[PDB]
Amino acid sequence: ITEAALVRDILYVFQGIDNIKMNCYKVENLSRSLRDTAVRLSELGWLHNKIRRYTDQRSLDRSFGLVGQSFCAALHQELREYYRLLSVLHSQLQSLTLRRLLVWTYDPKIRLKTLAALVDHCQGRKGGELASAVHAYTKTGDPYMRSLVQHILSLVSHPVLSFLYRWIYDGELEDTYHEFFVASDPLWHDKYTLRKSMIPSFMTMDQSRKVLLIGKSINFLHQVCHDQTENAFQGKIDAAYFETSKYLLDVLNKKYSLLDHMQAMRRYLL
Amino acid sequence: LPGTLPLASQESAVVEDLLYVLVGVDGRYVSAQPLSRTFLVDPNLDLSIRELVHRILPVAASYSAVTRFIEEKSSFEYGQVNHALAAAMRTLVKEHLILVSQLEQLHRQGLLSLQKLWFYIQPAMRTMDILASLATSVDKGECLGGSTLSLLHDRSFSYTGDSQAQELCLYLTKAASAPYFEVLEKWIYRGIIHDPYSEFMVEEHEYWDQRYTIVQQQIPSFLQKMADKIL
């Protein structure tokens, strides 16, 4: 068996398509110096399977949510590039050898090491609980991984910050699948519950009680009151707080005006 | 006879026939079977090719099921929305007839190996997988008029974070709702309701609570908030 023939099959084992057959890609003759280097190279292709099965099994059921899509659709932009590398490597096979591949594919032996171990740490997590389990991969320090995962977080946490900027300025939460940590009940004491399970890790437990209070302050301002209208992130919550609440008292003291009712509920009821 | 043919060269024969399969024209080896279209490749071919060919063909089947939605849903028995949804879904098929033209020319020079094909079609495998899901969710429940515009406002919200399949479903809705919105312009600044096919939300009759009645089915589900101020 010529060395060139091995270089022909390996360029397929990098994808899943099997001399080299299918958990290690046991190769089945040739000299021992060849089988050993194939084994490690063939195994990199096996990883590519574990990351492909997830982005194919969960791209099937429609009950994975809105965050579980931006994650399952951000594991593909990090795979087209892995399909560009296989393009270049195939054009030169017409020269490269085994010992020349090791340096070519030494870096995509790591990105296919974090992604193939990022989809196992978050298996049953849907909704925000998944955007909180791909953030527990940033406390790593490794400047090559902390700058990769801190990009997938910037895509996975886009739908979460889509409900938040909706449940703060308009107070109209809408999620058929239960993802947002503000659960409604089909106007102050009930119909609003802080979901302890779907709070993202990158929001402190106190910040999660200022959104449930800004959403409630606007939802209640419309129906019952009968009226219609990072560090910069923390400043946005407080900006939406020191304006909405200050307006809720004005409409509750001039038209009835939460404060204007406390005084009026003492004059008569007391 | 690809069995008695060398390995590294027969791959250049499949990539030629494979390009024809994307077009939908019956090829030499990769043929089609009578009708969700299922293909057959060959009994005696290399294992490390067929398992790779069968990964591309899901862009042929998702095209032999969209071209059959254009050549059908353009009839007059369907309204002024199942028309525009079938025209704005025809500009795309043209842009796919070019991405197979650029490959038919780049293959002459020998620069198109099978492994190189599996990379270039990656975007054309994802777009033809959205149009082959609306063309099967518009025929599942018979939609014409408004209910075929509620679907294109929910299939566009489910992709709220993809940004590669939401810039698309926002091009279909923005184009499959102009004819519906050109009669609304006539039922707002004036009283005349043309609506030849029975699809508009408001239908007239022949002392006035029975003349014009809101139809419940044909409400676009994004005008649901103002379904009363319209009438």
CA–CA distance from A66 to each of A159, A264, B87 (Å)?
7, 46, 30
Which residue matches tokens 């609003």? A192
The residue of A1, A2, A10, A12 whose CB has the most chain B CBs within 10 angstroms, and thus the best one to mutate to test that interface, is A12
Confirm if B134 and B151 have CB atoms less than 8 A apart. Answer: yes
The SS3 of residue B111 is coil
> In b/e form, how buried is each residue of B177-190, taking b as 16+ CB within 10 angstroms?
bebbeebbeebeee
The amino acid at residue A124 is G
d(CA A132, CA A157): 9
The SS3 of residue B32 is strand
Which residue matches tokens 């022949």? B206
Smallest CA–CA separation between A197 and chain B, in Å? 22
d(CA A125, CA A156): 13
Confirm if A49 and A119 have CB atoms less than 8 A apart. Answer: no
- From the list A173, A191, A11, A186, the residue with the least C-alpha distance to A91 is A11
Strands (DSSP E) along B116-167, which ranges? none
d(CA B169, CA B135): 12
Q: Identify which of A8, A18, A69 has the shortest CB distance to residue B47.
A: A18
d(CA A146, CA A130): 18
d(CA B126, CA B164): 9
CA–CA distance from A28 to each of A1, A6, A35, B75 (Å)?
11, 11, 9, 60
C-alpha triplet A158, A160, A162: angle, nearest 5°: 70
d(CA B186, CA B201): 13
- From the list B172, B174, B194, B198, the residue with the least C-alpha distance to B183 is B194
Contact residues on chain B for A73, CB-CB shorter than 8 A = 161-162, 164-165
Which residues fall within 8 angstroms of residue A8, CB to CB, at 6 or more apart? Answer: A93, B7, B8
Smallest CA–CA separation between A18 and chain B, in Å? 6
Q: How is chain A split among helix, strand and coil, in percent rounded to 5?
A: 55, 5, 45
- From the list A42, A112, A117, the residue with the least C-alpha distance to A79 is A112
Which residues fall within 8 angstroms of residue B171, CB to CB, at 6 or more apart? Answer: B88
Provide the sign of the torsion angle of the four alpha carbons A16, A21, A25, A31, taken in this order: negative
The SS3 of residue A183 is strand
Confirm if B214 and B201 have CB atoms less than 8 A apart. Answer: yes
The amino acid at residue B175 is A
The SS3 of residue A70 is helix
Confirm if B195 and B125 have CB atoms less than 8 A apart. Answer: no
Helix H or strand E encompassing A184: strand A182-184
Flag if B51 and A17 touch (Cβ within 8 Å).
yes
Which residues fall within 8 angstroms of residue B206, CB to CB, at 6 or more apart? Answer: none
Strand partners, B40: B31
Confirm if B195 and B183 have CB atoms less than 8 A apart. Answer: yes
Indicate the angle between helix axes A232-254 and A208-223, nearest 10 degrees: 30
- Parallel, antiparallel, or unpaired for β A182-184 and A192-194? antiparallel
A239 burial (CB, 10 Å; 0-12 / 13-18 / 19+) is exposed
Q: How many residues does chain A have?
A: 270
d(CA A42, CA A19): 11
d(CA B112, CA A10): 20
Phi/psi class of residue B24: alpha, beta or left (left: φ > 0; alpha: ψ in -120 to 50)? left
The SS3 of residue A131 is helix
Which tokens go with A71?
């994650």
B174/A contact by beta carbon, under 8 A: no
Query: Which method was it determined by?
Result: cryo-EM
The amino acid at residue A206 is D
> In b/e form, how buried is each residue of B55-74, taking b as 16+ CB within 10 angstroms?
ebbebbbbbbbbbebbeebe
Which tokens go with B47?
């294992």
d(CA B106, CA A2): 31
> In b/e form, how buried is each residue of A98-134, taking b as 16+ CB within 10 angstroms?
beebeeebeebeebbebbbebbeebeebbbbbbbbbb
Which tokens go with B141?
């429940």
d(CA B57, CA A76): 19
CA–CA distance from B70 to each of B4, B82, B108, B146 (Å)?
42, 10, 31, 19
Count CA atoms closer than 13 A to B206's CA, side-chain side: 0
d(CA B199, CA B176): 14
C-alpha triplet B14, A79, A158: angle, nearest 5°: 140
Contact residues on chain B for A15, CB-CB shorter than 8 A = 52
The residue of B46, B52, B103, B115 whose CB has the most chain A CBs within 10 angstroms, and thus the best one to mutate to test that interface, is B115
Confirm if B149 and B176 have CB atoms less than 8 A apart. Answer: yes
